[PDB]
Ligand binder design. Structure first.
Ligand SMILES: Cc1ncc(COP(=O)(O)O)c(CN)c1O
Ligand SMILES: Cc1ncc(COP(=O)(O)O)c(CN)c1O
Lengths: 415, 415
């Protein structure tokens, strides 16, 4: 009654509980979706230049983005997407990917609109939809029939997905690479989505914040580069998962002017400007990578290699303690199946109707010194029952952290 | 129909037209609401430390604010307000003042709620209200009966204001010091507001971004420090008008936990984190001013003095060319009456029903080389008729700019 009704149902963050519990224990924190090592020098220095350079960089820049930034964005991405991008009609700099999604949702979703959300989903898609009046409609990625599983096996059933589409569908949220699962969507997959999107006349909000984090030579493809798609796609990116600098909270949406004009309205009536210097830092950082694009010394070459090693490493460590990793094709993350623990250990302490994985994560923090994340926080509540056996790990960590993980794991193992 | 209805009516920015026109002319730009000189060294350096220091400052900080920042905020402001402030329940770091208002509105205002907006208003109060479903209800500050006018004479009529209050009033937006007028609200004024707010049970969203910019020894008072008010006040501030670094876009709301918990919900479903380093810069900057609070070398002492000089200077320059300045008690701004021009020059070129001051500003850009802002952009459309004779100037400028103004003014004067 004092609060607006749009807040109904979206006030609880299941995250918190656990950060609170992790901090009152000695832990290796693998629930954190960000590096614990420095960003690349070129990028840190880029920031250092922006705050040490032309003094007017401390004052306001342009509303829809700091032009050196929109410039490089439209160029580098226009090339990557295969698309002509006007910085002033097709690019909006936002407060991180979070900002971009929020802007997108507040633009497009209205009382009654349905949004198709693919499980597992980055958790904020559902609240944002709900805050905007929309109705989330869920479809589950479904793992197909080795012990080690693979992200690319998780399947978007063409009949199931076609069925979610109604006359009320405003948008489908497609996040690739997927967090938490790590799925990198295939071309044939994308096309499935593009095709139903094209058919029912529906916007594809597409969150590609993890674009650069790809492994095993799977290749990131943007639905926006598919024939006919640019006219109905909003592509989101984030400097923070680009340059391993999450704290910079700089993101953008790329999209056709007739959609963007609304994302702009929300922007000009919400935050109006993004801060200047960080934008400057990002613009420089992109210039550096575009200059060296594909080159061996380029960050987008070295980094995915480095983190693949981290992935591989974590995958082996966790494997031998009973956890059942699903190899990810990209993202900061891997999930592991814990169903073996559920059979061996069915009755762990927690609330009635609390999903197993949350109970399990809480256990492991207390006793084994390791933080992970209950995958069920990325499912519709109706679906947490059936999907209460995964946990999510972040392998974008320092060697010293992977060592500590190993220590924790070896100590646990004697059991 | 593709866009959400909340965007109805809020898509047009009357600002733009003029920036476009100013850039295709040789101008002294006094429509810009920000310095064109560097921030204080301590503050620029503070940023330089934050991006050059502990590398993990590049990663995510806490959701509701970077603790060194919420810490210093709660301390410095708790002292200034006379109030006990818990950083974690009473402070939210937002993306500038703009962010804070947006968060406040999306928290509290809902289909049907009325918001009382005092004219002239910072323009974004009306769209934000409208986007949230609310109904703006306007009351006009009204200048009381020398040639030079004064901001403090503009009056909030106690009967007029009491009359705006209905059972549907959710909030009243109080902005002091006022932009554009420069009014610094008096204690007796505040109390009027507090008292009706207290009576009808209504939140006072109070925008004090200009807190530090006060002149002639008028004193900034926060409605939040009035008896009984903290329980129904949200106070907004902005690092950018604090440290003359608008481009940093760091703001905050201070307020009682039972309100803030909703501002938090919006925050955690919109931007989630504010960027770390800038927060760090601000936290340091405040530490520096709090240490030297009231001291002669403190920025909050030196700066208002400096800008008072700039004010005084501009007031005299514009005075002698026929403009009729209203001395401001604070803010970055002064408005001048242009009714003499309207009598001398009634028929200037523009759209039918375009207010005089907009037509006039456009004229002055083209012919006299000076940018200002039509005050009518800060009135309800119904009220722009009667209030089409002011323009707004920003005197927070370098000497070299005030010189250029003078050049433009002297050249004009020969006429
Ligand atoms: C899938 C996904 N999309 C969007 C975001 C938004 O993050 P940020 O605002 O820091 O860019 C995140 C969180 N990093 C994410 O993992
Ligand atoms: C009255 C008023 N309030 C709030 C704001 C918001 O500005 P910012 O977001 O940069 O803090 C402004 C613009 N400076 C303003 O003048």
């Amino acid at each position: 009654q004092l609060q607006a009704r749009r807040l109904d149902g979206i006030d609880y963050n299941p995250w918190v509980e656990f950060v609170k519990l992790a901090s009152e224990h000695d832990v290796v924190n693998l629930g954190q979706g960000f590096p614990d090592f420095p960003p690349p020098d070129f990028a840190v220095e880029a920031f250092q230049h922006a705050v040490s350079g032309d003094f007017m960089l401390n004052q306001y820049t342009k509303t829809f983005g700091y032009p050196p930034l929109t410039k490089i964005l439209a160029s580098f991405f226009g090339e990557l997407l295969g698309q002509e991008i006007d910085p002033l009609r097709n690019v909006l700099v936002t407060v991180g990917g979070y900002g971009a999604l929020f802007t997108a949702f507040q633009a497009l979703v209205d009382e009654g609109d349905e949004v198709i959300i693919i499980e597992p989903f980055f958790d904020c898609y559902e609240p944002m939809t709900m805050m905007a009046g929309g109705r989330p409609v869920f479809v589950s990625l479904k793992p197909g029939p080795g012990e080690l599983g693979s992200s690319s096996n998780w399947q978007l059933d063409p009949m199931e997905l076609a069925g979610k589409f109604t006359s009320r569908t405003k948008a489908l949220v497609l996040n690739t690479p997927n967090n938490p699962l790590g799925k990198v969507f295939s071309r044939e997959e994308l096309e499935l989505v593009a095709s139903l999107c094209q058919q029912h006349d529906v916007v594809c909000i597409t969150d590609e914040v993890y674009q650069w984090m790809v492994y095993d030579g799977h290749q990131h493809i943007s639905i926006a580069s598919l024939p006919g798609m640019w006219e109905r796609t909003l592509t989101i990116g984030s400097a923070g998962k680009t340059f391993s600098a999450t704290g910079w909270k700089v993101g953008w949406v790329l999209g056709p002017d007739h959609i963007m004009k609304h994302l702009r309205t929300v922007h000009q009536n919400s935050v109006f400007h993004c801060p200047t210097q960080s934008q400057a830092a990002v613009a420089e950082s992109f210039e550096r990578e575009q200059l060296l694009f594909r080159q061996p010394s380029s960050y987008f070459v070295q980094f995915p290699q480095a983190m693949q090693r981290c992935r591989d490493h974590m995958i082996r460590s966790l494997q031998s303690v009973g956890l059942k990793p699903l190899i990810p094709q990209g993202s900061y993350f891997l999930i592991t199946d814990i169903s073996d623990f559920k059979r061996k250990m069915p009755d762990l302490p927690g609330a009635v109707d609390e999903p197993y994985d949350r109970r399990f994560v809480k256990w492991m923090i207390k006793n084994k010194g390791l933080v992970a994340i209950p995958v069920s926080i990325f499912y519709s509540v109706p679906h947490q029952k059936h999907f209460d056996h995964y946990i999510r790990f972040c392998f974008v960590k320092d060697e010293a952290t992977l060592q500590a993980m190993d220590e924790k794991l070896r100590k646990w193992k004697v059991e």
